[PDB]
Every structure is written in C-alpha cells, then in structure tokens.
C-alpha cells in the first residue's frame, strides 16, 4: 500500500519537473504512483543521480485512476485476422516473394493486429530474432491483457544462456535492431539517448546487442507516449519525429506552413551530468495525427547502403534512425538527400527502397486531412453513453466497428451500409491497381535473368534498374500503407498508375534487347 | 403544373401513334407527360418536323403514376461489390492480364453492380474515355437515385473545352465509341438511325465523336426500353437485336423453331422525311429473356479486323454493331460468317475473339430455359405483400436476396440453405475449371516467347495460334458470363474442358518444337 | 378506359372545371372516376338526365398511386385485434360497473388498423344485433379484402329483412346512419350536409340503418383528405365544418392566431 513522498524535497533538485507538475492536472498526484525513490533521495546530489530510482513504466501504473482508458487500451479485436501473411492470394501482396526477393520481409510479413500485442509480435515474428523468442503456448495468442502486463509473462527465450542473433528455426531472419523498439515500447525512455547515439548515460543505443536490449523491455505503446506524466499535456516522445519536425525545421505539417504554425511541438531537453541526454515534444493541442505519426510513418530503422558508392550504412550511422517525412512523390528526393537505399534486388541487381506503413504521409493533402480530421476521429473516438462520462477509447481500430461516431456524425445523410460501401468502392479500386502493378513488376523482374543469360548489355540492364527503383517505390508504398487507398484515393491512383507505367517501360526495353541479342 | 394538350390535333398527323395510343392502357395518359410540343404544333407540316418538340426521357417522367416501379428501379444493392477488378485473385479472372495482353480491358474490367449506375460506370471506367469523366466526389459512389436522375449531376468532364479522346491519367484507354451507349441508355432513341448508320435525320451515328455524344446523354436503362410508352405493350428497342431476330430471320429463340413461333417480335418502323429512320420490336408476350437480352449478350460494339486479310474494320462498317446470336459452340462459325476478329494477342500473335457477358446465349438450351423460365423469374420477380397490389421489382439482382420467390416457389421441397448450396455447388465446380483453363492458357502463352527466341518455325507457331483462338474462346466465354456456370452447367463444363484440351495440345507442340530447335 | 371529352363536361360543370384545370389532376381524365356516357346523351344544363356513376373505391386511385394505396391497405399485426376494454388486460377493468346498461357494455374493443374500420363497425356486438358477421374467422387478417369492399369479407345473416334486431343474445343495435360518416364516405353524393332530410339525398340521419349499411363498401376513402378534382387538401366531414364554420369556433378554437 502506497505512502506519499514529500514532493517539495524532490522539487529542490527537480525544477523542470516542478514547473510541469505543479501547474497541470496531475498537481495532486504524488510521485510514489510512478517512482520508488527512497534510496535515490538518500544518495543523490545536485549533479549525481546516486542510487537510481525505480520508474514504473507499466500502463497499469495509470489504471489506479484511469481504469476505463486502461481497459480499452488492453482490449483485443478478434475480427482483426491474426498472424496473417501478406505474401498470399488472400491478403495484400500475392506476388510479394518475387517483388521483395531476398529482403528479410520475405521470411514473414503479417498484417497488423490489436495494439496490445505490438511488442510481443515484434519479438516473435519470423523475420526478427531468428525464432529465438516464442509464445510459451499457442493458447497465449488471445491474451491482450497479459501482453500489456509484460511480454515475458506470455513469451519465452529459447536460449537464455547466449546473447547473439542467430537462427533457431530454418526459415527465419535476424532483422531486428534496437531502433525498432522505439515504435513498440518506451520502457527504455530513460535508458536511450536522443536518436540512440552512444552516450555515457544510456544503457542502450543503436549499436547495442539487440537480444540483450529485448530482455529489458516489457510493455507495449506506453501511455506516456502521448501524455506527459507530470503535466498531463499532450506530447510526442519519439526521437526521429522531433528531429524531423523541430531540429530540421520541417514542421508538424511539412506540406502546409500555416497549419504548422497552428500545431506545434515545443522541445524539452533533459540532461545527465550537465550533458543533453533525451527530449520530448510538447503539443500545443491534442493533435492525434502527430501522436499516431510517432509510429505510423515510413522510416529507416535498419542498415542500408549509399546510393553514391554502394558503401554499407550500419547502425552506428544516424541514418539508421530516420523519418523521411515526405509524400510518395517526394520520397525518392528525400532518400537521395541522405544518400541512402535499403537493399539490392537479388534478381535484378537494382538498388531499391524498402517502404513501411506510411499512413501519416499518405493522409497529408487528402480531403479529410484538409478538413482538419485526425486519425483518432475515425479510429479512436469517444465512447457513447446514455448516462456516463464519455471517455476516449484507447485501442485504435477500423471505423467499421463504430460507424456512427467515426463517419455518420459528419456524413449525416448516409446510412451505415452506404458509408461502408463508399469505403469498399475505394479499397476495391485501389486493390485492383495494386494487383496490376504486381503483375507488371513481377513480369519485369522475371525477364531480368532471361536478359542476362541472352547477353543483354550492362547499359540496358542499368537503364531498367533505374526504372525498377521507381516501379518498386510506387507499388510498395500501397502494400505498405494499410488503408488500401482510403486515406488518399487520388494519390494512390496516380502513384500506382506511375508504377505500372514504369514497369511496362522496363518490360518493353528488356524484350527489345533480348530479341536483338538473340538475333 | 402540367396542362393537357388536344391529342386529336396530334393524331391528325401522327396516325401510327394514334393507333398505338388509343387502344392500350395509356389511352387516358396525355402527351404532355412526356412531350413539350407547343412550338412544334405551331410550325410542323405533314412532312416537316418544324420546331423539334422536347421528349422527356427521364425514368422520373414515369414516376408521377408509377412511383413503386421507379423507386425499385433506382435502388442500390450495397452487397454487390463495387468497382471490383476481375484481374484479381479475389475475383473472376486472376490471370486475366496474361490472357488478354494489350487489349483495352487490361486497363480495367470491374464486376457489374446495380443497374442504376450503368451509364455513370460506362463513362468513368478507366478503359473508356482516358479518365476524362470522373465522379465529382468519391462520396457520390453511393448515389443510385442521383445517377438515375442524370449522370452529369454526379460526374464531371475534366476538360469541357475539347472533344477529342485522349488520356487524362496514365493508365487509361479510350475504347468507348457510340455503339456502347445503346446498352447503357436510350436517351438518344430519336437521334440515332437504326444500326447507327449515318442518316440525314440522326445527330449521332457509329462514326460520331464519342465525347460529344456522351455529353448529350443522362439516364440509365430507360423505362421505355422494355415498354412502349404509347401502348404500354412489351417491346424491345435495341437495333442489333431486331436485326438478328427479324432482318436476318434467326428468330427470338434461334435454337428452337417452335418457341420462336410462340414468342415474336413485330417490327414497327418510323420515318423522317419519308425515309426509314428507326425501329422497335413489339413483343406478343412479356418475355424478359428478350427484354434482358437487349444487353446481356455477346456482341461487337468496337473496331476489329478481317480474318481473311487482317484489314481493319472500323466504326463505319455495320459489323461494329452486331449481335452474334450464337451459343459458344457456334460462335467461331458466326464470327467467320462476318469475317471478323477482335484483336491480335500481343504475345502470341494469334487473332482472337473478345467475349462479353453472353448470358442469354448461355441460358438457351439449359434445363430452366427448356422449362419456360425467364431471366426475371430469378432476378426480377414480383414483391410479396400481405395486403397490397404486388408490382414487379425493377432492379434485377441475385436470387440469393429473394430465394422464396426466385427458387422455392418452384422447388418446394428445398429450404433456402439447400437451394443456395445447389447454386454454390455449380459455381464452385465451374470456377475450378476456369482456374485450370487459365493455368493452361497462361502456360501456353508464356511459352510463345521461348519458342520464338529458340528459332521455332512459323509453321509451328501458326499451328499453335489457331489452337489459341479456340483455347481463348472456350475460356473467356465463362469469365465474361456472370453466372459462373449456373445458367448452363453442362455447357460450361464441356466448353471449359475443351479450352483446357486445346491449351494442353498447344503447350505440347511448343515444348516439342523448342526442344528440337535447341538440340 | 377510353377518355371522355372533358371540354364537353365543362360546358355544364363550371364549378368542377375551376377546380380541375388549375391543380395537379388537370391531365387526369374524368373516366378514371366517373361513367357518364348515358348522362351526356340525356342531360341538359338544367336536367341531369341519367345519373352518371361515380367510382368511390380507393382502388380507383391505385392506377396512378399504388405506393399510397398499398400502404393504406396494410395491416399492423401487433395491434391487438378484437381486444375488449372491460378487462384487467386492457384500458378499463371496471368498465361494466361504470357504464352500466349503455350499449358500449355489449362490446367495446381497442382500435386496430384503418383498413378494417368499416368492417369492424358493421360486425361489433353493440352495433347491429350481430346481423353482420365475417364469412369465416379466417377473414380477420384480410386488410386488402376489407379495402376492396366490406361485403367481400362479411355477410348479412338475413338479407330478407331490414329491421334492427338481435341475432345473438348479448348484442345491441346502437348503430345509426350518423356513425358511417366516420367509417366511409361512399355516400358523399347521397347525403345532405349534416344528414338533414333532403329531396336529393337517398340517405339521412333518419334512414333505416340496415338498408344504408348495405349500400356502403370502402373504408376511409382517399378523397376524405384530398379533393379528387384539384388534389388540394380538404375535409369532407359535415360535423367538423359545422363546428369550425357554423358554430364559429375556428380551426384551432384555443388559438385565434393559429
Ligand atoms: C491517481 C492517483 C492518478 C494517477 C495514478 C494517474 N492519473 Fe491521470 N489524472 C488524475 C486526475 C485526478 C486527473 C484530473 C482529472 C480532472 O479532470 O479533474 C488526471 C488527468 C489526466 C489526464 C488529463 C485529461 C484532461 O482532462 O486533460 C491525462 C491525459 C492523464 N491523467 C494521464 C495519465 C497517465 C498517462 C497516467 C499513467 C502514467 C496517469 N494519468 C496516472 C489522476 C491520476
Ligand atoms: C508506436 C508505439 C505506435 C503508436 C504511437 C500508434 N501505433 Fe497503431 N499500431 C502500431 C503497431 C506496432 C501495430 C501492429 C500491432 C501488432 O501486434 O500487429 C499497430 C496497429 C494499429 C491498427 C490495427 C489494429 C487492428 O485491429 O488490426 C490501427 C487501426 C492503428 N494501429 C491505428 C493507430 C492510431 C489511430 C494511432 C494514434 C491514436 C496509433 N495507431 C498509434 C504502432 C503504433
Ligand atoms: C480437453 C479434452 C480439451 C479439449 C476438448 C480442447 N483442449 Fe486445447 N488443450 C487442452 C490442454 C490440457 C492443453 C495444454 C494446456 C497446457 O497446459 O499447456 C491444450 C492446449 C491447447 C492449445 C495450445 C497448444 C500448444 O501450445 O501446443 C491450443 C491453441 C488449444 N488447446 C486450443 C483448443 C481448441 C480451439 C479446442 C476446440 C477445438 C481445444 N483446444 C479443445 C485441453 C483441451
Ligand atoms: C515506427 C516508425 C516503427 C518502426 C521503427 C518499426 N515498426 Fe514495426 N510496426 C510499425 C507500425 C505502425 C506497425 C503496424 C502497421 C503495419 O503495417 O504492420 C508495425 C507492425 C509490425 C509488426 C506486425 C506486422 C508484421 O509485419 O508482421 C511487426 C512484426 C513489426 N512491426 C516488427 C518490426 C521490426 C522487426 C522492426 C525493426 C526492423 C520494426 N518493426 C520497426 C511501426 C514501426
Ligand atoms: C497516443 C497513441 C495515446 C496513447 C499511447 C494513450 N493515449 Fe490517452 N488519449 C489519447 C488521445 C488522442 C485522447 C483524446 C484527447 C482529446 O482531447 O481528444 C486521450 C485522452 C486521454 C485521457 C483524457 C480523458 C479521455 O478523453 O478519455 C486520459 C485520462 C488518458 N487519455 C489516459 C491514457 C492512459 C491511461 C493511457 C495508457 C493506458 C493512454 N491515455 C495512452 C491518446 C493516447
Ligand atoms: C468530420 C470530422 C468527418 C468525418 C469524421 C468523416 N468525414 Fe468523410 N468527409 C468530410 C467532409 C467535410 C468531406 C468533403 C465533402 C465535400 O464537400 O466534398 C468528406 C469527404 C469524404 C469522401 C469523399 C473524398 C473525396 O472525394 O476526396 C468520402 C468517400 C468520405 N468522406 C467518407 C467518409 C467515411 C467512410 C468516414 C468514416 C470512416 C468519414 N468520411 C468520416 C467529413 C467527415
Ligand atoms: C399517369 C399520368 C401515367 C404516366 C405518367 C405513366 N403511366 Fe403507365 N399507366 C398509367 C395507367 C392509368 C395505366 C393503366 C393501369 C391499369 O391497369 O388500370 C398504366 C399502365 C402502364 C403499364 C401496363 C402494365 C399492364 O397492366 O399491362 C406499363 C408497362 C406502363 N404504364 C409503363 C409506363 C411507362 C414506362 C411510363 C413512363 C414512360 C408510364 N407508364 C407513365 C398511367 C401512367
Ligand atoms: C441494357 C440497357 C441492359 C438491360 C436491358 C438489362 N441489363 Fe442488366 N445490366 C446492364 C449493365 C450495363 C449492368 C452493369 C451496371 C454497372 O454499373 O455495373 C447490369 C447489371 C445487371 C446485374 C448485376 C446487378 C448487381 O447487383 O450487381 C444483374 C443481375 C442484371 N443486370 C440482370 C438483368 C435482367 C434480369 C434484365 C432483364 C430484366 C437486365 N439485366 C436488363 C445492362 C442491361
Ligand atoms: C450490350 C450488347 C452492351 C454493349 C454494346 C456494351 N455493354 Fe457494357 N455492359 C453490358 C452488360 C450486360 C454489363 C453488365 C454485365 C458485365 O459483365 O459487366 C455491362 C457492364 C459494363 C461496365 C461495368 C463493368 C466493367 O466492365 O467495368 C462497363 C464499365 C461497361 N459495360 C462499359 C462498356 C463500354 C466501354 C462499351 C463499348 C466499348 C460497352 N460497355 C458496350 C452490356 C453492353
Ligand atoms: C426491361 C429490362 C424493363 C425495364 C427497363 C422496365 N421494366 Fe417495367 N416491367 C418489366 C417486366 C419484365 C415487367 C413484368 C411483366 C410481366 O407481365 O410479368 C414489368 C412490369 C411493369 C409494370 C406493370 C405493373 C408491374 O408488374 O409492376 C409497370 C407499370 C412498369 N413495369 C413500369 C416501368 C417503369 C416505370 C420503368 C422505368 C422506371 C420500367 N417499367 C422499366 C421490365 C422492364
Ligand atoms: C392517373 C390517371 C391518376 C389517377 C387515377 C389519380 N391520380 Fe392523383 N395524381 C396524378 C398525377 C399525374 C399527379 C401529379 C404528380 C406530380 O408529381 O405532380 C397527382 C397528384 C396527386 C396528389 C398530390 C398533389 C400534390 O400537392 O403534390 C394527390 C394528393 C393525389 N394525386 C390524389 C389522388 C386521389 C385521392 C386519387 C383517387 C381519387 C387520385 N389521385 C387518382 C395522377 C393520378
Ligand atoms: C374517419 C374516416 C378516420 C380518419 C379520417 C382517421 N381515422 Fe384513425 N381510425 C379511425 C377508426 C374508425 C379506427 C379504428 C379502426 C378499427 O377497425 O378498429 C382508427 C384507428 C387509428 C389508429 C390505431 C391503428 C392501430 O394500429 O391500432 C391510429 C394510430 C389512428 N387511427 C390515427 C389516425 C391518424 C394519425 C389520422 C390522420 C392521418 C387518422 N387516424 C384519420 C377513423 C379515422
Ligand atoms: C389442415 C389439416 C389444416 C390445419 C393443420 C389448420 N387448418 Fe385452419 N382450416 C382448415 C380448413 C380446410 C378450414 C375451412 C376453410 C373454409 O373452406 O372455410 C380452416 C379454417 C380455419 C379458420 C376459420 C374457422 C371458422 O371460421 O370456423 C381459422 C381461424 C383457421 N383455420 C386457423 C388455423 C390455425 C391458426 C391453424 C394452426 C393452429 C390451422 N388453422 C391449422 C385447414 C387447416
Ligand atoms: C367520428 C366522430 C366517429 C363516429 C361518428 C363513430 N366512430 Fe367509431 N371510431 C372512431 C374512431 C376515431 C375509432 C378508433 C379509436 C377508438 O377509440 O376506437 C373508432 C372505432 C370504432 C370501432 C372499433 C373499436 C370498438 O369500439 O370496438 C367500432 C366497432 C366503432 N367505432 C363503431 C361505431 C359505431 C357503432 C358508431 C355509431 C354509434 C360509431 N363508431 C361512430 C370514430 C367515430
Ligand atoms: Ca523504409
Ligand atoms: Ca465481343
Ligand atoms: Cl514482462
Ligand atoms: Cl445529367
Ligand atoms: Cl363490398
Ligand atoms: Co484477412
Ligand atoms: Co506492415
Ligand atoms: Co467480390
Ligand atoms: Co464484364
Ligand atoms: Co393488448
Ligand atoms: Na471479440
Ligand atoms: Na443496403
Ligand atoms: Na406483420
């Protein structure tokens, strides 16, 4: 049973926390709810931490006073198909194995499921840790509350005696590295320097042994990722987001200068031994586009290569923790700005980008974004109660489960069936274009070995490799992006038609050169 | 508010209309409901039209007295998947892009949806007008009543200043021509000479600028397509149907001479300046096989080529507005009769037919057709009311939505689940054969470049091109036809097995010749 | 139907012309609701000649207004039918004490759907001594049949007499001609304002109700709320016009402005 501490004693040293805490809606909430600092208080100085206090990072620490939000946060949507592979005629990318080749995603790329599972799913997917981590039982796949309480309560390490990345099962990969975890958990928020730079005060960095880092982490999407625990104010904590918006001055809405003045991030920096260590970004308004955009964006969180000379770019380089902060039509220029590509296609030899869930950068410029709508309006609205305080739901999911709040409050002349039909019209149209982009891209790729074997020149092959970069970018954006065009149907349509145009041009060039060489 | 005209004054000149109007169930319905003829009456002579009277062609003109039928006609089935591409593992023809090659259908071929949308969908599909016409908002896709009231209330032209067919978006085609519109609308019924021949009195013809024609049209599947507006009697208006049944003497049921004597079309011809101009075909009984067969048939409505010498066949030629009026086993002979094929396959170089929704010609000879069943019995029955006049529904759709009326009234020993299971048994079986026909046809097609590049002789390639014609015909009939075999399961089975047999023969010949040439 | 020359009709019917030519029925020919061939052959402006027929079935309107007609004939099965109110399950459990020997004590059921109103008036135990009865207890569901005509679904137990009397032991003969004005207006051209005796009226307040009943067929005729000539909204019920106009009370007697 908790005993409150003398907050004034803490404030004597912790003046920034004092300024945040005394002024906001947690002014009456005592430190003991989230910190055990008895030995710390006995041993600290103005400058030395002394004994490190415990910080309780479980979402359950908030549940004593916010049970409603915590229960919603831990909830599971069983209708979100679990562990469903995308390289599959029943899913998003039937030809993915041809198109992605030997990239790590070829070992497994499933569709997303409920937020409660995010850290568990990161740990156990076949592409991440060589199959090292596994659910303790296949019964455990249902346990959202268990996952929230801690990954290691439901999964286990197949070899606690070693820390190396290796394969435990034949068809797995070891693609995980420490940067990944920033979009799964912030349990390490006090143990990771801004951007993951090596730092005297950081136990973990981009260059850490990822198996050891994994074992130190527990909880998914911590509540304090979107709310400052001291002031309650809305914020973001994700380093690479703050870097793009603030350090690089690109703004919260990089395509809209006025909106970027209306929605702002105010950086706060915390130090260790008088040296800058970590940052947060305080929001002036609770804009969920920025909160959700901590994770639902295209990023680098992985080694790659330089476009200029092909040299490896490893985890020591800041480019391996980067938000591109660009729409699909600006992405190629943004990747050139950092002189970077992800992988060389195993079949075609083309340098290629690897794209991931660019929801926010797709949403920019869309009709709903232009009308001031945000992610949470459609995916995470308030509950509706005849006789209750209407809190915000806290496990985002498709608007199909909540159409009256998500759509019909604005679109008041539609029935639920009509609004869903409008969704399906866009998704069906967009999916059809994705299928055709895959047909043409796979056709181009399958012709590369024919061309090489027929003696087609390097000049022709290099021309088509350059087309492959763009054919790939303007296809993969849309298999990566989870709305199947709904977030921006006109952009999806223009981009996918560009992918097809490029692949058709590449097929034509290869067929002509093969026929000439023959022969 | 309408004021009635003196009909006797009209009849003085319009003696055929008098004979039709005074005798039928519209004898009390005044001309002013459907015509504004004040200046016409002031200026006409026995032979000159003078000022052209207005003819109201909106289905809503009928709604003053037939609201029930009009409301049903405008209704939308949201469960009919909209804008769903067929070249897709989730739809009818997963390998369509290989099989159809560079044909215009490769730019987009969606599944059908509710009748209300037919003219809109024609205008906006990616293969038709280069993307020139577009819904004004993606919200508008739900608006069936809006579409019925006029296409241009819900879609717009991206460049009203020009009339040429061109691409506005990269992956579109300009396959539309004026003949298409005859199966979408009959707003042009007084502006189009029989067969679309150029004619002094016709504003529009097969050779018209299709973008200009499009702008003059508004409403889908006009009510008077199946009902004479003057007499109320059942009729057809589609020129190419009347041409096959009457002018060419093939009969309403070309495979059944006795049934063709029982169900008849009586032509009525109307003149302009003493010259034959347009025709309708009066039905002796309200046989919906003929009414629905105005559109749900295999046709030419497009340029093509001569089988004999390969010469282009353009819109000036009557062959571009033609009903083949033949079952799948007679089709090759029927296309030879007019010396015609649609396209040369881009990969194989084979002349090929292009098939479209041959529902009526598939239905002929089937068990239900032989038992006197018609399309409307399963797709457009009467409403069921405990205490009301039971009118006919007017938006045809799957019998799954109305199983008691569509099936179980006859099949009185089945439950709804049993009747649906019998449908699914046939569709599953037929779909499996379509998949195998695609596998074998795609396999044959993919071997053509290997054979050409290995130096296989033109004699062998020409043998396999002739097999390709039949392999294609006996596959595509079944992806074109929308019942997935239900309308004629034994015919679907024989035809698809023939497609497979032909493709297997072609693969064998190509493999043997490649091996010999090599090794 | 073959249309008549309405201009000819207008030569002797200016009051109807003025209503017909200006409204939304201007194009609707007289033949939909009147058979007047012998009338035209024999009339002068000062002599009716043969009385023309006027069709009063709601089904006369269904040729052009099927949607409204179908809804008009519909039956709400959830409205409990033939449920007596003097009953612990209904509105007035002590009704038999309170009303005593009044005719309503023989039977007073809750209302049900409009389609049945004339039928129900004819067959209730308090109205005609049980003289009129459904032809079968199956017929109670038939809303459309009732709309098409009461006598298609009910029958008279003694067509040979016209007196009000009891046919069943616990019935009453409370009906009189005034009742029918709230059940039907098939009699609209045969009933003078207020039901006064009148040379031109075959029926009146003082008529033999059994004979009057046999001349009536359809419930709540469509033209009770809509003028058939102009389409404009109207009332036809004499007592309501008498309250608003003759008694000088106005349409809303508690609100002068309204
Ligand atoms: C009880 C001892 C609490 C603990 C533990 C947590 N919170 Fe809290 N919170 C508490 C109170 C009394 C209030 C003010 C309520 C009021 O309006 O009177 C709050 C408020 C918040 C808010 C603010 C919402 C708003 O109105 O602006 C947020 C976002 C919030 N609390 C978040 C939060 C988090 C994430 C917690 C775990 C780290 C947490 N709270 C714990 C009381 C208590
Ligand atoms: C990083 C910590 C994240 C934040 C912040 C947000 N999301 Fe998220 N989301 C994230 C992951 C890693 C996943 C997949 C989890 C798994 O185990 O597979 C998701 C998933 C979703 C989904 C799909 C849910 C489903 O039913 O399938 C949605 C609809 C979604 N996310 C939306 C969303 C919103 C609206 C956010 C801001 C309120 C948000 N997410 C933040 C990672 C992270
Ligand atoms: C009693 C006769 C059982 C029946 C019927 C079903 N299950 Fe079962 N299951 C049972 C036991 C005792 C266990 C082991 C539990 C443990 O101590 O670990 C299980 C296990 C499972 C699992 C996990 C399997 C694994 O990890 O190897 C799953 C996914 C599971 N059970 C599901 C399941 C389903 C869906 C059932 C209905 C078809 C079912 N079980 C029946 C006992 C019994
Ligand atoms: C924020 C910019 C992220 C980074 C860094 C990583 N992931 Fe991620 N992940 C993110 C989101 C928003 C989602 C849900 C949306 C989606 O398209 O899946 C996910 C999902 C996953 C999943 C579940 C789905 C799957 O691919 O199987 C896994 C297993 C996963 N993420 C693993 C993973 C790895 C190994 C990472 C570093 C290489 C990584 N994630 C980083 C957001 C972000
Ligand atoms: C970003 C992806 C979030 C995470 C992680 C958590 N919350 Fe949240 N919270 C979020 C939004 C977009 C909102 C609505 C803000 C608005 O003004 O519209 C909220 C709101 C709250 C509140 C306020 C009361 C309410 O509206 O429900 C509280 C007390 C709160 N959130 C608590 C909370 C808890 C306990 C969390 C971990 C279980 C948590 N939030 C995570 C966004 C996000
Ligand atoms: C208010 C905050 C809204 C929410 C919630 C939803 N929609 Fe919306 N939508 C809104 C506006 C103001 C508009 C523009 C209307 C106009 O004047 O043109 C739209 C537009 C759409 C569209 C058309 C998009 C386009 O053509 O670019 C669609 C298909 C649409 N809306 C659907 C839709 C759905 C299904 C929603 C629930 C997920 C939804 N909207 C929510 C306002 C708001
Ligand atoms: C009222 C002024 C009408 C207009 C406008 C339209 N129709 Fe009509 N129709 C009308 C009547 C009074 C009747 C006779 C009804 C009866 O049986 O007494 C009809 C009949 C038809 C039918 C006949 C069905 C049959 O019983 O054989 C058809 C097929 C029909 N009407 C079609 C139709 C069309 C297509 C209209 C718009 C062009 C149209 N009608 C207008 C009255 C009126
Ligand atoms: C030409 C004017 C047509 C006539 C006459 C008939 N049909 Fe039709 N039908 C036509 C088109 C162009 C379409 C596709 C419309 C679109 O926008 O996609 C259709 C569609 C159908 C369907 C599918 C409806 C659905 O829910 O998906 C059916 C079941 C159908 N058509 C049947 C049918 C019947 C039975 C007809 C005679 C009563 C009939 N159609 C006539 C074109 C035309
Ligand atoms: C009558 C013989 C037709 C001719 C001439 C044209 N179409 Fe058609 N169309 C017809 C039917 C019966 C249907 C529904 C059945 C089906 O298989 O689709 C259609 C459907 C369409 C559609 C919607 C479905 C799709 O293919 O995307 C479109 C866009 C369409 N039709 C366009 C179109 C064009 C461009 C035509 C001239 C080249 C044309 N149609 C002619 C019947 C008939
Ligand atoms: C052919 C594809 C049709 C179109 C276009 C329209 N109607 Fe129709 N109608 C059609 C059939 C097959 C039938 C049933 C005929 C039979 O005897 O079984 C009908 C019937 C009517 C009627 C008669 C009353 C009824 O059965 O509902 C009317 C008044 C009628 N149709 C009107 C009408 C209207 C107003 C239309 C445009 C909105 C319309 N029809 C188009 C076939 C077809
Ligand atoms: C066809 C020959 C009709 C007959 C028989 C009846 N009505 Fe009618 N009505 C008819 C038309 C063409 C119209 C105009 C429709 C329009 O869209 O404007 C009407 C209109 C009415 C109205 C509405 C007037 C308004 O203010 O909107 C009413 C109330 C009406 N009709 C009533 C009615 C009655 C009660 C009938 C039987 C006595 C009747 N109509 C017959 C066509 C025809
Ligand atoms: C006299 C011609 C009437 C007119 C005008 C209206 N109503 Fe009526 N109503 C009337 C009777 C005689 C009955 C009982 C019929 C029977 O057979 O029992 C009714 C009944 C109703 C009801 C109850 C319906 C049910 O489901 O039980 C309602 C709700 C009702 N009436 C309402 C109503 C309205 C709103 C009217 C103007 C539009 C109206 N009535 C006119 C007699 C007459
Ligand atoms: C066949 C074996 C029957 C069974 C089972 C049920 N009914 Fe019947 N019923 C049947 C006949 C041949 C008749 C007489 C029809 C005639 O020619 O008049 C009836 C009559 C009724 C009646 C009217 C009774 C009367 O007026 O005396 C009613 C109300 C009725 N039936 C209802 C009914 C119910 C509700 C049934 C299931 C409990 C039922 N019947 C079964 C034939 C048969
Ligand atoms: C209009 C002022 C009416 C007069 C005159 C008569 N009735 Fe009536 N009746 C009227 C209404 C609005 C209703 C429904 C509302 C209700 O409270 O019932 C009725 C209902 C009936 C019924 C069915 C219910 C019942 O009492 O059993 C019957 C059998 C009936 N009315 C008979 C009846 C008789 C015999 C009348 C003259 C003595 C009479 N009604 C006049 C409206 C009016
Ligand atoms: Ca990336
Ligand atoms: Ca064809
Ligand atoms: Cl844990
Ligand atoms: Cl229009
Ligand atoms: Cl009767
Ligand atoms: Co799925
Ligand atoms: Co993904
Ligand atoms: Co589908
Ligand atoms: Co089709
Ligand atoms: Co009751
Ligand atoms: Na559930
Ligand atoms: Na619906
Ligand atoms: Na009912």
UniProtKB/TrEMBL annotation, chain C:
GO molecular function terms noted in the UniProt entry: heme binding; metal ion binding; nitrite reductase (cytochrome, ammonia-forming) activity
Binding site for heme c 7: 136-137
Binding-site residues for heme c 1, renumbered to this chain: 9, 12-13, 39, 51
Annotated heme c 5 binding sites: 79, 112, 114
GO cellular component: outer membrane-bounded periplasmic space
Keywords annotated in UniProt: Calcium, Heme, Iron, Metal-binding, Oxidoreductase, Signal
Binding site for heme c 4: 68, 222, 225-226
Keyword flag Heme: yes
Binding site for heme c 2: 25, 61, 64-65
Positions of the UniProt region annotated as Disordered: 75-94
UniProt biased composition (Basic and acidic residues): 75-87
Binding site residues for heme c 6: 109, 126, 179, 182-183
Gene Ontology biological process terms, A to Z: anaerobic electron transport chain
Positions annotated to bind heme c 3: 30, 33-34, 229, 234
Source taxon at top rank: Bacteria
Protein location: Cell envelope
Annotated family: Belongs to the cytochrome c-552 family.
Protein name: nitrite reductase (cytochrome; ammonia-forming)
């Amino acid at each position: 049973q908790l005993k409150p501490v003398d907050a004034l004693q803490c404030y004597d040293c912790h003046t920034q926390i004092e300024d945040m805490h005394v002024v906001g809606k947690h002014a009456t909430v005592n430190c003991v709810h989230c910190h055990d600092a008895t030995e710390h208080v006995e041993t600290a100085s103005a400058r030395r931490m002394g004994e490190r206090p415990v910080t309780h990072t479980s979402p359950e620490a908030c549940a004593s006073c916010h049970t409603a939000q915590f229960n919603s946060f831990a909830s599971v949507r069983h209708e979100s198909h679990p562990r469903e592979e995308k390289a599959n005629p029943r899913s998003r990318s039937p030809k993915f194995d041809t198109l992605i080749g030997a990239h790590g995603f070829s070992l497994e790329h499933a569709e997303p499921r409920s937020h409660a599972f995010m850290l568990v799913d990161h740990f156990i997917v076949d592409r991440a840790y060589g199959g090292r981590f596994q659910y303790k039982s296949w019964q455990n796949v249902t346990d959202g509350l268990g996952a929230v309480r801690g990954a290691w309560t439901v999964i286990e390490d197949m070899d606690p005696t070693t820390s190396d990345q290796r394969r435990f099962l034949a068809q797995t990969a070891t693609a995980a590295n420490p940067v990944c975890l920033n979009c799964k958990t912030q349990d390490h928020i006090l143990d990771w320097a801004y951007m993951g730079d090596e730092h005297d005060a950081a136990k973990w960095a981009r260059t850490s042994k990822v198996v050891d880092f994994a074992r130190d982490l527990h909880h998914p999407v911590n509540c304090y990722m979107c709310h400052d625990p001291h002031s309650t104010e809305p914020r973001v904590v994700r380093d690479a987001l703050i870097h793009a918006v603030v350090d690089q001055g690109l703004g919260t809405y990089p395509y809209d200068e006025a909106k970027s003045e209306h929605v702002t991030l105010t950086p706060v920096t915390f130090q260790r031994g008088g040296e800058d260590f970590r940052k947060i970004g305080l929001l002036n308004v609770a804009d969920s586009n920025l909160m959700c955009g901590q994770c639902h964006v295209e990023y680098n969180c992985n080694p790659g290569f330089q476009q200029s000379d092909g040299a490896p770019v490893g985890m020591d380089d800041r480019r391996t923790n980067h938000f591109f902060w660009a729409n699909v039509f600006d992405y190629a220029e943004a990747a050139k700005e950092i002189d970077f590509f992800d992988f060389t296609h195993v079949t075609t030899g083309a340098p290629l980008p690897k794209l991931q869930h660019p929801e926010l950068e797709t949403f920019w410029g869309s009709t709903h974004e232009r009308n001031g709508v945000t992610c949470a309006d459609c995916h995470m609205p308030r509950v509706k109660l005849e006789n209750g305080k209407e809190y915000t739901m806290h496990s985002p999911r498709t608007p199909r489960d909540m159409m009256n709040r998500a759509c019909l409050n604005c679109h008041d002349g539609w029935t639920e069936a009509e609004a869903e039909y409008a969704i399906d019209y866009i998704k069906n149209y967009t999916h059809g274009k994705i299928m055709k982009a895959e047909f043409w891209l796979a056709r181009m790729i399958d012709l590369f070995p024919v061309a090489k074997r027929a003696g087609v020149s390097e000049d022709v092959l290099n021309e088509v490799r350059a087309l492959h970069y763009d054919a790939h970018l303007h296809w993969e954006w849309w298999t990566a992006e989870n709305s199947v065009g709904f977030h921006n149907p006109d952009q999806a349509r223009e981009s996918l038609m560009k992918s097809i145009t490029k692949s058709k041009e590449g097929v034509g060039k290869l067929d002509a050169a093969i026929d000439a060489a023959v022969a």
